[PDB]
Structures are given as structure tokens and as C-alpha cells.
Amino acid sequence: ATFEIVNRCSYTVWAAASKGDAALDAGGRQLNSGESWTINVEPGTNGGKIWARTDCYFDDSGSGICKTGDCGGLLRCKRFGRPPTTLAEFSLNQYGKDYIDISNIKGFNVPMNFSPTTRGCRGVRCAADIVGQCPAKLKAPGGGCNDACTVFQTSEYCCTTGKCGPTEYSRFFKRLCPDAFSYVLDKPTTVTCPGSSNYRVTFCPTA
Numbered sequence: 001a002t003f004e005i006v007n008r009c010s011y012t013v014w015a016a017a018s019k020g021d022a023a024l025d026a027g028g029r030q031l032n033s034g035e036s037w038t039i040n041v042e043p044g045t046n047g048g049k050i051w052a053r054t055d056c057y058f059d060d061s062g063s064g065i066c067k068t069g070d071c072g073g074l075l076r077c078k079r080f081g082r083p084p085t086t087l088a089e090f091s092l093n094q095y096g097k098d099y100i101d102i103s104n105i106k107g108f109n110v111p112m113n114f115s116p117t118t119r120g121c122r123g124v125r126c127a128a129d130i131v132g133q134c135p136a137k138l139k140a141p142g143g144g145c146n147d148a149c150t151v152f153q154t155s156e157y158c159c160t161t162g163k164c165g166p167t168e169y170s171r172f173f174k175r176l177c178p179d180a181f182s183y184v185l186d187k188p189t190t191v192t193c194p195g196s197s198n199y200r201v202t203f204c205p206t207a
Contacts, residue, residue, distance in 0.1 A: 001092055002198045004038045004117065005050060007031035009204035013052035013110060014066060016077040017041070024048055027076035030056075031203075043093045043196060050088040051081055052110040052203050054143055067142035068109040083107040084144035086126060086180075088114040088201045098193040102126050103181040104173040108134075109144040113205030121193035126177035127206045135172060147173075147183075159184040 005015045012032050017024035017039055025039035041048060051069050058064035062075035069081035084107025091099045101124065102114050108130040115123025134145035148157040148169035156164050164185055166174070174182035179189050 001041050001043065001045075001098070001196060002038055003041060003050065004036050004200045005031065006036045006200060006202045007033060007052075007204070008202055008207050009033060009052075009110065010207055011054070013054060013203055014056045014058075014069075014075065015050070015052060015203075016069060016071060016081055017048070017050045018071065018077040018080055019045060019048050020080055021078070023076055023078050024050075027078060028053075028071070028074070030075075041090075041092065045090070045092045046094070048090045048092070049080060050090075050201050051085040052112070053081060053085075054109060068140065068144045083150040084109045084140050084142075084146045086110055086112045088112060090199075093195050096195045098195060098197045099190050100124070100193060100199070101181060101188075101190045102177070102179065104130075104177060105147055105149075105181050105184060105186075107138075107140070107144055107146040107150060108173070108177075110203045111206060113200075113202040115200055115202075116193055116197045117200050118194070118197045120197065121191050124179045124189060124191055125205055126180040127204075128176035130173065130176050133172070133176060135169065138169060138172075157183075 053066035053069035056066035071077035
């Protein structure tokens, strides 16, 4: 499948794409305001993620640091990034379907729209000002709004037992972004698409 990744923010993001134990395509790129990066993802990719990183400095070997979403200091991500990160999540060609969602389960850094560019399903967007509205205890100094599991590391926030309910903190993400996952056991907002669809991820879909 192809994914076009568009930076519509007025500031530079460093896009990242990773299946957790491997880069997808080049794995990361600088995107200035207005730039698009088209990547190819192997059909049958399970648990792929795309996200944006803010305030990054890299050297000439592509080692450095980002204030949100850093993946152990590399330009080209292999691991997932450090919260807070808004996440475009996908599993492709799972018994003839593609599954897509946006997740706030690891916090929120940049607003995002995640849509097919082919027919047969609709997209999802989380474009609210979550950083601006963010509860005081969830605010990440770097910019961004952390999830409660990242901040507090409890069984309840993290559903480490596999049982957990919504919380004050999850209710906040959900109230601003009803279509994003707000905690591990949220009623799914997964969208099912035809096997082998193509997609666009747009940062700051609304700027």
C-alpha cells in the first residue's frame, strides 16, 4: 500500500513510520510546512504506526533528539516513539481487510487526519486543540499532552490487568476526539477498509 504523508502544519515536523521492530520504508523524514512524503508499506503489515515528531535536531549521521515522539534519537525510526504522540495505526490485508484508527492512548502532540485515498471506507480525524485544553498534570514540558498511563503508571491507567474503565483523564481525550481511542479498552473506533487500500495522513488537517 502507499501512504502519502502531508505536513499541513505551519511548523516543521519530522514524520516517522515503524512497525515496532523495523522501519517502514525509510522510517523517517523531515517535512516542512506543505511537504508530502509518499511511502510504500508491504501488504500484510500488521501493527504499523505513523506519527509526527516536533523540535528535532539531528546531526549529519541522523542522530539527535526530538521533544515529542523521539525513537531513540534516530531520524529514521525503527522503534516506536516516546509519548506524547498522536498515532495513525494500521493493519493491512488481515483476512481481506485493512484496519485503521487514530489513537490517543500514548498522548497527543499534533492534530491528524487519517483517510483512504481509494474507495470503500471513511477516514478519522483528531483535530481538536488537545495541547491547549490539556489537564495541568498531563502537560508535557516538551509540548504535547501525555496519556495518564505514561504519567502515573498505574494498573488502572495502563489496564495492565486487562480490566480497567474510562477515567477522568481518558474522558478528556474522548470528549475532544470521539473518533480516537482514549484508553486501552475504549469501544473500538477502528475503520475497516477494503484489503490493499491506499491512504493519506495529514498533520494539522485543519491549519
